[PDB]
Amino acid sequence: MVLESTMVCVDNSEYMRNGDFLPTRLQAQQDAVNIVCHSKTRSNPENNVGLITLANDCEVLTTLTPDTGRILSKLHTVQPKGKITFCTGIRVAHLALKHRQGKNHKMRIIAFVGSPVEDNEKDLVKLAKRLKKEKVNVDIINFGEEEVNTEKLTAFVNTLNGKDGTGSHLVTVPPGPSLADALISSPILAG
Amino acid sequence: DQFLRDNLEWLARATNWAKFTATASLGVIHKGHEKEALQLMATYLPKDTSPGSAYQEGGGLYALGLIHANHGGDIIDYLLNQLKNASNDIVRHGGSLGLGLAAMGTARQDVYDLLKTNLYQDDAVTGEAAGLALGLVMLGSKNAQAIEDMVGYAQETQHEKILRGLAVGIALVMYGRMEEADALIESLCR
Amino acid sequence: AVDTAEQVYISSLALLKMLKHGRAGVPMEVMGLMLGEFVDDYTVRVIDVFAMPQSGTGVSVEAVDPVFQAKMLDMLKQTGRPEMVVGWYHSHPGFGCWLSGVDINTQQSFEALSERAVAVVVDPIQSVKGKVVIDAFRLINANMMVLGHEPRQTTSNLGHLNKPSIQALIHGLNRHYYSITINYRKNELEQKMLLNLHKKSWMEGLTLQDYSEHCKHNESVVKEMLELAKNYNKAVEEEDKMTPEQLAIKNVGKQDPKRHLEEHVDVLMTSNIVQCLAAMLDTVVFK
Amino acid sequence: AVQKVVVHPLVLLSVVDHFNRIGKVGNQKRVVGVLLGSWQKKVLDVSNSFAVPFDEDDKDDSVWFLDHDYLENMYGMFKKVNARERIVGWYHTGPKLHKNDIAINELMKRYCPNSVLVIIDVKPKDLGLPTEAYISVEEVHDDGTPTSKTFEHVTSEIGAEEAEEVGVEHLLRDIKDTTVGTLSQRITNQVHGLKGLNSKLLDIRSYLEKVATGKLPINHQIIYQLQDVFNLLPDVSLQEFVKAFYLKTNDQMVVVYLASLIRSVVALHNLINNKIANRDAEKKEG
Ligand SMILES: [Zn+2]
């Protein structure tokens, strides 16, 4: 199977507590963690997946482990109130990826951005060239309400990698009512 | 020598370094006799028949080095080629000792170079080999880069025999220096 | 097959875990394992030492837990250096650290798996400070009864290892076993700082505090022990003035002297602490 | 709370040998591990420890993580083999703690009620007893600010028990022991005195440098009170300090009087007996 370590990032920003995604984004992104942890389980047994809180202070409560049980426990009562913070959210998972015992696993990060961010374009392009030097491939899936047809995030994924690098894909929520399972139905079949 | 004729079972008891010294005595008793010393040993020659005694074939060139000390001849290069041939490091033990002891006091140049790339083969028992050899060829020369490289190789090496071979090596390079060597003696003693 | 003089390069961390794992089990004998790397036959090194848990079967070949070895080596894989196992060790705090019947009963298993598997024993009891103590053991091959049992060559470390000859019951194991030499490799910087670490005892705690604590007491209440020292003056020297007259009666030395010598000279060395540290007051009080 | 800690040479080396572990691969940052303490009483003691791989980004200088599975099952390993050992905190090699080291203790406060972090030093240089000890406590402030954590310094001392004494006491093989009464006290007069000179010198150099550069605060708070504590005692005579002078002179009376007494006793015995056995050996043999 493919060798890599996937680090899932839940969105704890205060804008993620609304029930626009049925029944609530808390359970919606919980099912999103359910489908990414079960797919990586069906992908390779050697994949270890932790969680990271992006907004406010960034702390990983569950050390990187192949078992998602403790991750599912932290999905409940997470108290996702705070202001979204982007620039640190990728690097905090990058440090968790440098603590891996085995060096044969590729560095992989999946994050959810459900809130408008104040991150400047200079900061995301500095992280883009930094990830170019660090080879890390990040697959982001945009939830929630944000700038219509997100650009700085799309340009972030574009300028993140190149040639090929097969790759970083960005999935933005369509402007219409839908279930969270329908939003994650596309990435699970094809990245 | 009648020795191998009079004592036999004692020599059959020989193992490990015993056959080194056994064929090394072949050169001690043959000391002198520069001409036929090479061809007269053909029966006791450093085989290298590969039921490996290989300290045997190392001590054979050691015997050829005990005779060829001080002055010498093309046999020095004969041992030098065999140092670049056959196996390692078993040849370097008495072979490089033969190469350095035969060039002792002659201030030989190429031996300092080919012993640096030979010193880098990274083994232990050969530590005293190249150390005493490089110390004998540089005897009385009070050189600079020779002691500099010997004191520079003593760090990354994990062997104490290369430390002792280079100990006598940098000790033998200086002879009769009186107060001229005290500049380095202060650093070695401190 | 080929046998040569052996030398064990040890790390200070190995010896620390040795005596630490042996001190926590006193009197009961514990069971550890030796960790390191085999470079060649004539030289060997132990770069790490870890301890095995104590079980109900006691010290036995079954006491080694396989799932503990799998998880430890995994924890060593996430550790900086995951070196392979080499041999075993067990402490003997209660006696002279000699191999028992179970020690060889696990030795044929450690020599089965591992080629060498040198057995080491350590005890705190023998010397509190100035001796290596510990021990060394290696099982000779019983299949060598055909050939001779008396190697090695380069007898330097061998003939020097045998001495003292280590009693009788220990060298009663010299049949079927033989010891191995141990040297301390430097690593001089850590050896020097850890040297000063225990020197904090007799020098001072911080190299400042304890003799600034000698500036705390500083004759205090240190004259009380001078009053007991001057009571040792009166006591010892009132029977010291009876000695030279008796020397004139018995004509002369009974060998002797009673000693009844030195002593309060050291009290006068504390008087050097009196004059010095009190002369510091002129520096302390003024500016 | 925690007053003083006893740091054995075993835990210090257990950090420094791991500084060789990740030091051969380098590069930056520090060696961080979990500290195994032993609490018999208010005085804290340390016996063993274990180190965990740790990395800290600078970007993001506030990001830190440890392996909890390593802390969990190895604690299950060390508690198994030794039931007396438990984790009292963590440690790092510093040399000076960055502001991010607080949250590490706040994460492991679930393991131990009070986690004491021990800064250590792998390369001995200055000024004295190595390492350091900081206890996690909330002191708030006299300024009534929202409660923040400034770790209070815990005095650290080096000690041992039995076997840990055996190893190092044989490993010294360096300087005379002690020797009691002659070189010991006077070398301590050099070290504690001179290291006390450059201590407060460089520390008073920081006193003025912090006022020159680094403001704010900086100065306030403790500056005015601490500096006035320096101005508590100048402290010279007149008067009673003059009385202490010749009283101290009256104190040296007895001891030096006793000194002359030992001089007479030592000279009497040794000289008389030696000359006896001397003149006798010469007149009988000659
Ligand atoms: Zn036993």
Side-chain angles (χ1 to χ4, degrees):
Chain A
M1 302 297 182
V2 56
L3 301 180
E4 85 283 355
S5 296
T6 307
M7 190 68 179
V8 65
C9 183
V10 300
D11 197 343
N12 54 325
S13 62
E14 61 184 346
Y15 302 155
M16 288 297 297
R17 299 174 284 104
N18 48 335
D20 62 334
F21 294 160
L22 277 66
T24 309
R25 290 187 187 171
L26 280 72
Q27 189 173 352
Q29 76 183 16
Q30 179 171 358
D31 298 338
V33 176
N34 288 130
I35 61 99
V36 300
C37 76
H38 292 83
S39 180
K40 295 299 180 178
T41 305
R42 301 298 182 271
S43 178
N44 192 38
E46 299 181 357
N47 301 341
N48 44 350
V49 180
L51 52 79
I52 169 64
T53 165
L54 54 89
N56 192 25
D57 189 17
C58 298
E59 296 179 353
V60 169
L61 278 69
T62 67
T63 311
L64 197 66
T65 174
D67 185 22
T68 183
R70 189 183 296 102
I71 284 86
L72 303 183
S73 65
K74 298 298 183 298
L75 295 176
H76 302 283
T77 185
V78 68
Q79 194 71 29
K81 185 187 64 60
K83 179 57 181 175
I84 174 177
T85 320
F86 183 81
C87 178
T88 184
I90 294 92
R91 193 57 52 192
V92 60
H94 179 267
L95 188 63
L97 265 41
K98 293 197 298 296
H99 300 169
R100 299 170 293 101
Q101 44 178 10
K103 295 180 298 300
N104 295 274
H105 299 286
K106 302 301 180 181
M107 289 176 286
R108 180 180 302 275
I109 300 175
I110 50 173
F112 299 148
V113 177
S115 301
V117 67
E118 299 179 353
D119 183 83
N120 198 336
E121 60 183 347
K122 299 180 63 63
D123 295 337
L124 57 87
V125 73
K126 282 191 297 294
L127 298 178
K129 62 182 64 180
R130 182 60 177 174
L131 292 180
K132 281 187 175 301
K133 302 298 181 62
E134 295 174 350
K135 204 182 65 180
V136 182
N137 300 125
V138 184
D139 300 338
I140 307 99
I141 300 176
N142 294 342
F143 287 157
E145 65 278 355
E146 204 176 3
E147 183 73 16
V148 47
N149 301 129
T150 63
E151 187 275 337
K152 296 184 301 299
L153 277 70
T154 303
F156 172 75
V157 176
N158 195 341
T159 58
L160 188 146
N161 58 338
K163 304 300 295 182
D164 295 338
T166 172
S168 297
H169 301 75
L170 181 62
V171 179
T172 60
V173 46
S178 179
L179 295 179
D181 293 334
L183 269 62
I184 55 94
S185 179
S186 178
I188 184 176
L189 178 60
Chain B
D1 299 345
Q2 70 286 355
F3 302 102
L4 281 79
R5 310 300 179 269
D6 58 50
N7 50 78
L8 195 147
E9 305 84 0
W10 180 96
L11 190 139
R13 185 184 55 89
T15 180
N16 193 335
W17 295 105
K19 276 175 278 295
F20 195 113
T21 297
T23 188
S25 299
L26 164 74
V28 178
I29 325 165
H30 285 78
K31 193 178 185 57
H33 191 51
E34 177 72 15
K35 181 58 180 176
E36 201 185 2
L38 175 60
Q39 55 187 16
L40 192 144
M41 299 176 177
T43 303
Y44 304 149
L45 237 54
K47 303 171 297 297
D48 202 15
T49 43
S50 179
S53 182
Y55 299 147
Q56 166 62 232
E57 54 177 332
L61 308 184
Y62 182 77
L64 271 63
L66 302 166
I67 297 173
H68 295 75
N70 297 275
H71 302 74
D74 194 26
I75 309 99
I76 302 176
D77 298 336
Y78 171 79
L79 271 64
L80 199 156
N81 300 332
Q82 290 170 329
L83 255 60
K84 301 301 179 63
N85 299 136
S87 178
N88 293 275
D89 59 338
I90 47 96
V91 173
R92 302 145 49 107
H93 304 169
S96 63
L97 248 43
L99 178 63
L101 186 60
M104 172 190 65
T106 65
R108 194 178 191 272
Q109 179 54 254
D110 298 338
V111 67
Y112 163 70
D113 295 340
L114 62 97
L115 252 60
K116 285 200 305 297
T117 180
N118 201 29
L119 183 67
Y120 293 151
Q121 293 189 354
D122 183 75
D123 202 337
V125 51
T126 183
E128 299 172 346
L132 295 174
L134 187 52
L136 285 165
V137 300
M138 305 311 298
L139 163 66
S141 62
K142 64 172 300 180
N143 201 337
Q145 289 75 7
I147 294 92
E148 181 181 3
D149 293 345
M150 284 184 283
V151 81
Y153 184 79
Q155 289 76 358
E156 69 278 10
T157 180
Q158 59 181 14
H159 323 295
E160 77 287 352
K161 286 172 291 301
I162 186 64
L163 301 181
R164 175 168 55 257
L166 266 48
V168 195
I170 67 177
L172 213 149
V173 63
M174 292 177 177
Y175 185 83
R177 291 294 161 264
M178 301 300 160
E179 79 285 352
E180 301 172 355
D182 297 347
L184 181 61
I185 301 298
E186 182 272 344
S187 178
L188 304 184
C189 180
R190 187 173 303 276
Chain C
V2 51
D3 295 336
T4 322
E6 308 88 358
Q7 180 61 59
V8 181
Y9 301 144
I10 74 106
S11 59
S12 185
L13 68 103
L15 171 135
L16 289 190
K17 270 71 179 180
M18 287 294 295
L19 47 81
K20 169 176 58 189
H21 181 44
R23 180 57 186 169
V26 188
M28 181 177 178
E29 57 279 359
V30 301
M31 165 63 72
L33 288 179
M34 181 177 65
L35 188 53
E37 180 269 350
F38 291 152
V39 48
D40 48 24
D41 177 79
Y42 53 91
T43 51
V44 65
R45 60 174 57 188
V46 42
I47 205 167
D48 189 17
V49 158
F50 57 95
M52 296 296 299
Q54 295 82 0
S55 291
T57 317
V59 172
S60 62
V61 62
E62 299 85 359
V64 179
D65 189 18
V67 300
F68 181 89
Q69 290 302 105
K71 190 182 297 299
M72 187 66 179
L73 292 175
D74 184 24
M75 286 183 171
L76 297 180
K77 280 189 286 291
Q78 47 190 7
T79 321
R81 186 184 59 254
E83 65 273 10
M84 182 59 180
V85 299
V86 281
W88 68 291
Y89 80 90
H90 67 302
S91 299
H92 275 164
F95 48 88
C97 68
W98 55 284
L99 298 184
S100 63
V102 187
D103 298 336
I104 180 182
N105 276 285
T106 194
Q107 261 293 93
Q108 86 266 349
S109 302
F110 277 110
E111 76 181 346
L113 177 62
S114 179
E115 176 185 2
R116 300 172 181 84
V118 180
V120 184
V121 194
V122 63
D123 164 53
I125 294 298
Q126 301 302 322
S127 81
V128 69
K129 41 176 178 179
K131 184 185 175 182
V132 283
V133 199
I134 199 174
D135 206 335
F137 290 104
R138 182 56 179 85
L139 175 63
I140 198 63
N141 297 333
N143 302 126
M144 293 177 63
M145 60 179 295
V146 181
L147 203 61
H149 283 83
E150 289 77 8
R152 315 289 177 278
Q153 291 76 8
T154 68
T155 324
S156 314
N157 60 336
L158 262 64
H160 297 166
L161 175 71
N162 186 27
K163 307 302 179 182
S165 181
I166 191 64
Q167 309 290 108
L169 195 143
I170 310 290
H171 107 268
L173 307 174
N174 188 28
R175 181 183 60 187
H176 303 166
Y177 315 95
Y178 63 96
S179 177
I180 196 169
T181 62
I182 295 101
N183 65 332
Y184 298 86
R185 59 185 179 92
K186 276 71 181 181
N187 298 126
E188 199 279 336
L189 174 136
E190 210 290 328
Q191 178 59 249
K192 180 184 57 57
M193 65 184 301
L194 178 130
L195 192 154
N196 187 27
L197 251 56
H198 195 291
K199 286 300 178 180
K200 305 301 185 178
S201 179
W202 295 95
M203 173 71 180
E204 347 188 14
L206 203 133
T207 62
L208 281 69
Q209 296 175 340
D210 280 347
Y211 266 80
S212 76
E213 295 178 353
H214 280 77
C215 297
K216 291 181 181 181
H217 307 75
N218 220 346
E219 301 105 18
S220 35
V221 196
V222 192
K223 182 157 269 296
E224 275 75 332
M225 75 173 293
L226 297 180
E227 288 171 350
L228 300 181
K230 81 179 179 179
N231 287 333
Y232 302 150
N233 296 349
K234 296 181 175 62
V236 180
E237 293 164 345
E238 73 190 344
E239 57 180 346
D240 279 338
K241 61 188 181 64
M242 296 292 100
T243 54
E245 299 178 355
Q246 294 173 343
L247 293 170
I249 285 117
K250 52 186 180 289
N251 290 329
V252 42
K254 267 189 179 298
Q255 54 174 14
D256 291 345
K258 295 183 179 179
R259 180 59 179 85
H260 295 266
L261 280 88
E262 295 300 326
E263 291 126 1
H264 314 292
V265 180
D266 309 338
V267 173
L268 309 177
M269 308 310 287
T270 66
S271 181
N272 305 346
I273 303 176
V274 177
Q275 55 185 20
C276 76
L277 290 187
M280 296 292 185
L281 291 177
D282 298 337
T283 72
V284 168
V285 143
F286 189 75
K287 307 297 290 187
Chain D
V2 180
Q3 179 179 357
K4 60 182 178 299
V5 297
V6 179
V7 174
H8 297 177
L10 277 62
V11 49
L12 180 145
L13 198 156
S14 181
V15 196
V16 179
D17 68 344
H18 195 273
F19 183 78
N20 186 27
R21 294 290 181 89
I22 67 105
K24 61 179 181 179
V25 79
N27 293 319
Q28 206 57 47
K29 196 194 54 61
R30 50 180 50 86
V31 175
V32 175
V34 189
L35 177 66
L36 281 162
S38 177
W39 179 280
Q40 189 60 53
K41 196 48 188 173
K42 182 173 55 56
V43 46
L44 195 148
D45 194 353
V46 182
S47 296
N48 201 342
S49 292
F50 56 94
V52 54
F54 165 81
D55 294 324
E56 174 261 353
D57 286 339
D58 58 339
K59 291 293 188 298
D60 279 342
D61 56 339
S62 299
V63 188
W64 57 268
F65 294 110
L66 298 174
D67 184 20
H68 295 79
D69 185 26
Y70 186 84
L71 199 158
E72 278 297 331
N73 285 134
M74 174 160 286
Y75 180 81
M77 287 181 176
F78 287 160
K79 184 69 171 179
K80 179 170 54 178
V81 59
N82 194 339
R84 192 66 60 181
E85 200 73 15
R86 63 182 178 273
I87 57 108
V88 83
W90 66 291
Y91 53 79
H92 59 285
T93 193
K96 296 298 179 296
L97 69 92
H98 60 300
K99 193 180 181 179
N100 187 33
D101 284 333
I102 167 182
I104 290 88
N105 195 311
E106 309 313 299
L107 170 131
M108 58 178 60
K109 279 185 63 62
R110 58 181 178 181
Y111 293 97
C112 184
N114 50 336
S115 298
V116 47
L117 64 94
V118 171
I119 309 176
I120 70 105
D121 193 353
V122 293
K123 300 176 299 300
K125 295 176 297 299
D126 286 326
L127 201 55
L129 164 138
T131 73
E132 203 272 347
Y134 275 126
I135 181 60
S136 179
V137 280
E138 298 83 356
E139 79 287 350
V140 200
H141 203 271
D142 192 25
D143 197 22
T145 65
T147 301
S148 179
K149 177 174 299 291
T150 303
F151 296 93
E152 291 298 325
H153 174 62
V154 171
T155 167
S156 179
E157 59 183 346
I158 310 299
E161 192 261 338
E162 283 298 325
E164 34 183 347
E165 291 180 349
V166 183
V168 192
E169 275 163 334
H170 184 77
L171 273 178
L172 53 96
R173 292 292 295 177
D174 186 23
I175 202 62
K176 310 177 185 66
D177 47 344
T178 304
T179 54
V180 181
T182 162
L183 54 87
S184 182
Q185 70 288 355
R186 61 189 314 162
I187 273 106
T188 62
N189 293 337
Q190 275 200 337
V191 177
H192 93 274
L194 189 143
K195 274 70 177 182
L197 307 181
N198 52 41
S199 178
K200 195 56 176 58
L201 195 151
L202 274 67
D203 291 335
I204 217 175
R205 182 65 60 184
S206 62
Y207 283 157
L208 187 63
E209 182 272 341
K210 288 302 179 298
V211 178
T213 56
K215 192 84 166 298
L216 297 169
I218 216 167
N219 205 340
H220 297 83
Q221 190 89 24
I222 205 63
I223 292 299
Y224 65 79
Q225 185 175 356
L226 176 149
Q227 193 182 1
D228 205 345
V229 173
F230 182 90
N231 209 349
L232 252 48
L233 52 93
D235 46 342
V236 300
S237 58
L238 278 65
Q239 181 68 266
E240 300 84 0
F241 185 61
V242 175
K243 272 70 180 179
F245 273 175
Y246 72 90
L247 185 146
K248 172 60 182 58
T249 300
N250 209 345
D251 299 340
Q252 192 63 267
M253 301 274 288
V254 179
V255 192
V256 181
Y257 278 143
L258 303 173
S260 58
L261 264 55
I262 285 113
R263 297 305 174 276
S264 61
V265 174
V266 167
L268 190 141
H269 290 74
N270 298 343
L271 279 44
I272 293 305
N273 288 279
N274 209 351
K275 292 179 67 61
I276 287 175
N278 188 23
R279 72 169 192 84
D280 290 339
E282 186 272 336
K283 73 180 297 180
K284 289 299 296 180
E285 185 175 359

